[PDB]
Amino acid sequence: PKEPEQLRKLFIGGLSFETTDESLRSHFEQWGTLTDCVVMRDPNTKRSRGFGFVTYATVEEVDAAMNARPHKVDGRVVEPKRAVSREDSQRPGAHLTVKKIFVGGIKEDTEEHHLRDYFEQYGKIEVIEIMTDRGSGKKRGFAFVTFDDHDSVDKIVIQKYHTVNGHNCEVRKAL
Numbered sequence: 001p002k003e004p005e006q007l008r009k010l011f012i013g014g015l016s017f018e019t020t021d022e023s024l025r026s027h028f029e030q031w032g033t034l035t036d037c038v039v040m041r042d043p044n045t046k047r048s049r050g051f052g053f054v055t056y057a058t059v060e061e062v063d064a065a066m067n068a069r070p071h072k073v074d075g076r077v078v079e080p081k082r083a084v085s086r087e088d089s090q091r092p093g094a095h096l097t098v099k100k101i102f103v104g105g106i107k108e109d110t111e112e113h114h115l116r117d118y119f120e121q122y123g124k125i126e127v128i129e130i131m132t133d134r135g136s137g138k139k140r141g142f143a144f145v146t147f148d149d150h151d152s153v154d155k156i157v158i159q160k161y162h163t164v165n166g167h168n169c170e171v172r173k174a175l
């Protein structure tokens with residue numbers, strides 16, 4: 001069946017105030033079937049709030065849209081982000097826009113190439129830090145991976161599971 005709708009939505013910030021439901025749809029339909037497309041407006045003035053959202057039919061279409069960034073919509077470069085699927089209890093509905101993940105549960109036998117070979121298919125990697133003990137140099141069993149862009153992290157933390165070097169890993173957004 002269909003992927004959950006929350007995982008098919010893109011919040012689009014930085015809209016031109018002239019962008020409409022129709023012009024936002026004409027732009028983003030280039031990368032897939034849109035089941036929803038709305039510009040947020042003031043309830044009294046109808047003036048744009050400067051953001052909106054689009055819902056694609058599939059997650060692959062969301063990927064296609066994010067891979068086609070930067071998006072210039074009605075003359076303005078906009079800021080698409082996947083919808084918050086797991087929120088911070090203290091900042092409900094806020095996207096924590098970061099480029100770095102914590103990867104835990106990798107034990108002492110996981111090396112840099114294990115992490116790179118796995119995570120490079122989510123995005124362009126800039127830093128891999130396998131954490132070692134300050135006193136002994138022994139591996140501590142966790143790592144940080146820094147990407148060049150936040151959408152890689154968003155794709156990663158949406159997954160229920162990550163298997164790296166045969167280990168079932170815990171992955172979360174970092175700093």
Ligand SMILES: CC(=O)Nc1ccccc1O
Binds near residue numbers: 084085088155
């Ligand atoms: C807190 C936060 O930024 N959550 C989030 C955002 C995008 C995709 C998945 C997520 O869990």
